[PDB]
Design a protein around this nucleic acid. Sequence first.
RNA 1: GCCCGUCGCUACUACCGAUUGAACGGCUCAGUGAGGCUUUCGGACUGGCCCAGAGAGGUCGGCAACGACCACUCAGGGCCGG
RNA 2: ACUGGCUGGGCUGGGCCUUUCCUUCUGGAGAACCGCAUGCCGGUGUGUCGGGGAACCAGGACUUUUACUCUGAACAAAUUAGAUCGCUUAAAGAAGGCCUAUGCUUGAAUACAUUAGCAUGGAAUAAUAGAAUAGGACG
RNA 3: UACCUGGUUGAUUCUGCCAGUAGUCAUAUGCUUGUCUCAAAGAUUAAGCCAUGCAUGUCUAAGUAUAAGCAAUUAUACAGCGAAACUGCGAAUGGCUCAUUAAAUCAGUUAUCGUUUAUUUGAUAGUUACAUGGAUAACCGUGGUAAUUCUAGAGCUAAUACAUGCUGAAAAUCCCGACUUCGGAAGGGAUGUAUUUAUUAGAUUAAAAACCAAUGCCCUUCGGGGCUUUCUGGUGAUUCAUAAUAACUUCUCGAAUCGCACGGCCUUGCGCCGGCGAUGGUUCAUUCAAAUUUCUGCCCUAUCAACUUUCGACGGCUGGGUAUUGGCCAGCCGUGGUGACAACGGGUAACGGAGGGUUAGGGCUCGACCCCGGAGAAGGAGCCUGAGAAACGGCUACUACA
RNA 4: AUAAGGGAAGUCGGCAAAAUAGAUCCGUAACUUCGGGAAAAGGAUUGGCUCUAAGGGUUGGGCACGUUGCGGCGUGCGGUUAACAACCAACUUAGAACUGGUACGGACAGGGGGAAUCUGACUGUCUAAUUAAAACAUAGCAUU
Lengths: 201, 150, 261
Amino acid sequence: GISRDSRHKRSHTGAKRAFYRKKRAFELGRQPANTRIGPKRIHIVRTRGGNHKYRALRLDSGNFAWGSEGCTRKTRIIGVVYHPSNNELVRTNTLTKSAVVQIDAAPFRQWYEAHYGQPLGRRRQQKQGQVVEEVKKSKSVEKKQAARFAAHGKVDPALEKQFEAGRLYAIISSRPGQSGRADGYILEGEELAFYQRKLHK
Amino acid sequence: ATELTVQSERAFLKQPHIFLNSKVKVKSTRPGKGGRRWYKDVGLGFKTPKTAIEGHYIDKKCPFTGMVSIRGRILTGRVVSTKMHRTIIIRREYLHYIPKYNRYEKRHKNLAAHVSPAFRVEEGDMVVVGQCRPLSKTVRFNVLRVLPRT
Amino acid sequence: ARGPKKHQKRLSAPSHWLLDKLSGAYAPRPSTGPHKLRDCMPLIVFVRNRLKYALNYRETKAIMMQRLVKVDGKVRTDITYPAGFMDVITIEKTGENFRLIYDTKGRFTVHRITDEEAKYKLGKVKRVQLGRGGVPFLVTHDARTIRYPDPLIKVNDTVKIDLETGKITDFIKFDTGALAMITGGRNMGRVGVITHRERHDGGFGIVHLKDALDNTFATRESNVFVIGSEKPWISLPKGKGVKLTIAEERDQRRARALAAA
RNA sequence: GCCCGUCGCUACUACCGAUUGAACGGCUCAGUGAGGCUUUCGGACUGGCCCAGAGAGGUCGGCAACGACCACUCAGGGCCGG
RNA sequence: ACUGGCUGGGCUGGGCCUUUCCUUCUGGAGAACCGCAUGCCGGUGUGUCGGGGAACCAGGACUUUUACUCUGAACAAAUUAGAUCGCUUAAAGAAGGCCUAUGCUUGAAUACAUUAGCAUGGAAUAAUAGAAUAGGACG
RNA sequence: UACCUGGUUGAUUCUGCCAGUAGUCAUAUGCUUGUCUCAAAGAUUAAGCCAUGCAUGUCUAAGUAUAAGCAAUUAUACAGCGAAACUGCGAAUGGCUCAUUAAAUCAGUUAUCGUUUAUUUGAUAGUUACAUGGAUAACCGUGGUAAUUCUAGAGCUAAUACAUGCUGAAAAUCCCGACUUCGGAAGGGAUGUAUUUAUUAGAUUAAAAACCAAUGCCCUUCGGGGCUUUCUGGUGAUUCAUAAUAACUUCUCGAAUCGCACGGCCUUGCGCCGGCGAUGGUUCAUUCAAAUUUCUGCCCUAUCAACUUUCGACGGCUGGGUAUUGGCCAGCCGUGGUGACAACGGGUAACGGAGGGUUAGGGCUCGACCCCGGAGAAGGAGCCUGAGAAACGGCUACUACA
RNA sequence: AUAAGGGAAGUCGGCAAAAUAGAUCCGUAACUUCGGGAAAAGGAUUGGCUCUAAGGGUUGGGCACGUUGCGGCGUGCGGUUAACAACCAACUUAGAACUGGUACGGACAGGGGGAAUCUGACUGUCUAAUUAAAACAUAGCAUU
Ligand SMILES: [Mg+2]
Ligand SMILES: [Mg+2]
Ligand SMILES: [Mg+2]
Ligand SMILES: [Mg+2]
Ligand SMILES: [Mg+2]
Ligand SMILES: [Mg+2]
Ligand SMILES: [Mg+2]
Ligand SMILES: [Mg+2]
Ligand SMILES: [Mg+2]
Ligand SMILES: [Mg+2]
Ligand SMILES: [Mg+2]
Ligand SMILES: [Mg+2]
Ligand SMILES: [Mg+2]
Ligand SMILES: [Mg+2]
Ligand SMILES: [Mg+2]
Ligand SMILES: [Mg+2]
Ligand SMILES: [Mg+2]
Ligand SMILES: [Mg+2]
Ligand SMILES: [Mg+2]
Ligand SMILES: [Mg+2]
Ligand SMILES: [Mg+2]
Ligand SMILES: [Mg+2]
Ligand SMILES: [Mg+2]
Ligand SMILES: [Mg+2]
Ligand SMILES: [Mg+2]
Ligand SMILES: [Mg+2]
Ligand SMILES: [Mg+2]
Ligand SMILES: [Mg+2]
Ligand SMILES: [Mg+2]
Ligand SMILES: [Mg+2]
Ligand SMILES: [Mg+2]
Ligand SMILES: [Mg+2]
Ligand SMILES: [Mg+2]
Ligand SMILES: [Mg+2]
């Protein structure tokens, strides 16, 4: 089958090597698996030494971590928007490592509301559609939460605009074809500005 | 080396596992701990160049600010080609002994090595290289020091 | 070659086994175990070729099936068990204990030892570090792993093992002035005192020793085995590994012959 | 005395030569293309449940108040697997 | 076997003064030369004395660079040269030997390979670098 | 044992070859042949073709026994030996040959901080239970085909085959908080390991102060004088060994197995506790290794002087794939790499080496063949099982024989 | 204009007809006056639809004062935006996915080729109304 040896190549002087031996059990290769967004589907494969690997054919969710605070919540991925290697990967919407995606921001907004007693990215005040208040059952909570707000600080203006729409950009940092998991982190700061600057022009 | 800009590529270049966007600012002496540039020392009495510590270039093959370890032989030579990108060719000369005729003849070999942006290498120079893991089809050495010109 | 080997050809066996080139085509092919394959002492060769207790293979393998012979206090039942440096072999029915140690000519020799001293060993340490859960441990040259050691103990040292409880009673530092015996290289059987050590950055250092007779020699660190500072703890065999040259070797041979008769 | 070349007869060796001469072998453009790994639908055949409940029957204790369980036939639906 | 020698003659080597002699700091233990009082037959333990570190060890920095040669390390069994033992001698073999033993004892050595790679001493021979627009050395 | 003789001329001295001479662990052949110690042998031409027979199986006190098996008579669950069969392991080692192969194999010397590893050896893992569920072999009995180690449907029963499954501890850490006097607190959840991602610690190795912000405290004459301070391994070198936090997973492991011994307690219940072995099991270490990898070294030929990049040729970047690195592969961007110090190509009656033959020294020639390494099983490709195979006394397909 | 199977067996003779044909990318011999032979010979692709990438133009750049009613000026004096911002404009080339009764230069337009001999060097010209050729002319050469 597919071979990954260097025998069939050409020497650095340009000379052509001659036949040495037939293909070996090692040095083999395998058919690439193109991950796509859809209902979960994973196959098991028996690799060298009796171990196993996990081929992911269709995935829809994975862990993504928010950097500064350090909390990670499981949510779903909407779609891929950029890929440094090939554009056709983007158009076919297939996801691999170093793929820029868009993720749901709901679990992170909820956790932020629980940790800090203030709302983040709410420009729906024009509509006043979902205004609701629940009585908060304590008074030590305001001093602890306001202590957190006065100590840690406030979010940069760029991230609330993302939170109002409810979509966040992320980068896959796992290898879906190898480990069968799509994992990443929410990207922000100057590296974020790099991607918005490149994304629309 | 001479590089106009650091980020001039399709993807974003950054050192792995170096966290760069932290809300709280803490000043520490450690190179990689605080969130600033990371670097190490190869050893064998080789001193880290000054340009590396404050430079902004990103390279994953430099022995400094990179993910490559140096182990094996250490060799020296004369550069013969440095006109491609981030790689040079050195020329090594030696003497082979023919037993029957009781005298020598000259022979030579060609070697390929990876050059870091920290150094500036011109033609006809002495360099010292060290063995490393396979970095390409025919590149297995890295430059460590450039000897002064005559 | 499509897997691991399981046959060993005669004329390729280690020289210090002293196997005749005739009378067969194969050799015992020692099984895998605690000691290196190149320098080991198979139990079948030791019992049959040196002690001459068993005439041939058939009853040689019967002996271990009766569980008569044990090493390090634990009975072994496989004929090709790799024995090695400093290990203690005990035969209770006849009532004696043996220790495997090189002679001055680089081969294993029979060496009677007393019962009270035949119940402990000592070995050089190979690596020390902390394992899973933060528990420190070390491993010696005979695949002995011991947890919670003395924190001052470092690599290349030697440690005394009880062999019944596996506790670290005592140790010897690796420094100048110690008494050492060589275990690898062409300098087989020598015993000397560390004079001074010179190091080379990048690996493969050399150490210089000095014998009792003012002889001088050098060897790699991987071949030095310190056995004491002064008055070595173990009992050395006859000759003490001094490596007399052939001129006096023949002189003493004739002197001893005429002295006896 | 020695001795050189053409021409004629016999014997042998190699060379040029119309015949788009002939046979065998290696590497290759193009066309056709067995088999198999991976992959997408497919579901021969099989297993497990849960409800409602037809129809009948039995069980062990309860005066009773009431509980529980086990065999037959037609099943109704499902609604999940390999 | 063998002792002093001989003011013996050679030869190898190691210390100083000749304008040259031999890098440097930290730490280790500690000698030689000194006196203190305590004790014997003009020397010594003496110590819980310090003035004092010959040599040695461990660690750091500095030192033109190659070829060459000396000595080490590492490197296969067989083979080649080669030591020992009367397989009745020998080509072979690694055996055997000792009074009488219900026992004791030994050998199964050693040198070479030779190209490349790793350390150490020597510094002749044969190449290379350095202060001239001083861009030089020192405090 | 560092050696020569005959031959051009009427006779002489030379260059020069022809012939003679000796060895061969070097083959064939002719004549002849009594004994002792040792014993090579279808390599050369055809890696051409094969009738026949053999060359790989395996059981202990200790996985599974209702043999209409034998043998005894302590075992009414069995208890000895034990056909058949399931299950476990091996069959990838050995043995043969030299077709291909000219920096390829190979040799000496390095590296793996760039990987996999059955087995052996040593350590090591506290979140219905007095015992869970369906099949199947052997077996009884009935068939098909000229033909094979081909098999159908019907009726039974086992597991160390297959599939499920039980916080017995405390302490500590992190979050939510019912409830106040605002200065801490009722009680609620999580917390082994494997897998995947992000973040934190993993210290230095000379010393003397003075200010701002504001809080553990001792003593005390209430004016206060003040404040010594606890750990941190290793390499020449790392993001190392290891620890902690927020989460994740068609997802692991943490024992429903077997044999010998017949013991000890009192609340005397068919109660509780207790020894030595076998077979398994997560991680680390070790052993046998395996795959890649650094430097230098191979015969003749110029009537072979320029070669390599169509469709990777040299390098950079992002990924895929592999046990892992790598132009091994997919995209984007540069235009490189080798050569008269002999590249590239053509020949080889070429497997390489340790080594054999022949000797003053220097050399010439041979090496299929008992030792080490590589490759192949008529010629090509593809693959299952398994730790390990691109295996051929394993399978699939084509060509040629049969 | 079309024809099953055969494919020049018809005939003085392949006369007539058929076959090839555009564009893009590979590949290309003997011979030679080194200019050619060459479109040698001989192969592959070609529609529709939805996308991606490349090839341009114009206008803007610091202070310090003085006229003229925030501006045109007059000046003096610095920096080269690690090249940014807005607007405007036609076509030509390359690449990817899906799709169809495998069809796509869909009509028109549009070279058959190869191995040899005789003869004139070539382009050119003539018997208007039966002969276009090997005939004539030609540059070159030689003579009077
Ligand atoms: Mg084999
Ligand atoms: Mg090392
Ligand atoms: Mg083809
Ligand atoms: Mg097919
Ligand atoms: Mg002999
Ligand atoms: Mg004559
Ligand atoms: Mg043959
Ligand atoms: Mg054959
Ligand atoms: Mg039994
Ligand atoms: Mg051959
Ligand atoms: Mg184990
Ligand atoms: Mg099982
Ligand atoms: Mg890569
Ligand atoms: Mg060049
Ligand atoms: Mg051959
Ligand atoms: Mg050979
Ligand atoms: Mg094979
Ligand atoms: Mg095969
Ligand atoms: Mg066969
Ligand atoms: Mg076989
Ligand atoms: Mg027709
Ligand atoms: Mg027709
Ligand atoms: Mg035809
Ligand atoms: Mg006719
Ligand atoms: Mg005709
Ligand atoms: Mg016509
Ligand atoms: Mg054509
Ligand atoms: Mg033509
Ligand atoms: Mg198309
Ligand atoms: Mg066409
Ligand atoms: Mg004409
Ligand atoms: Mg006319
Ligand atoms: Mg006409
Ligand atoms: Mg004319």
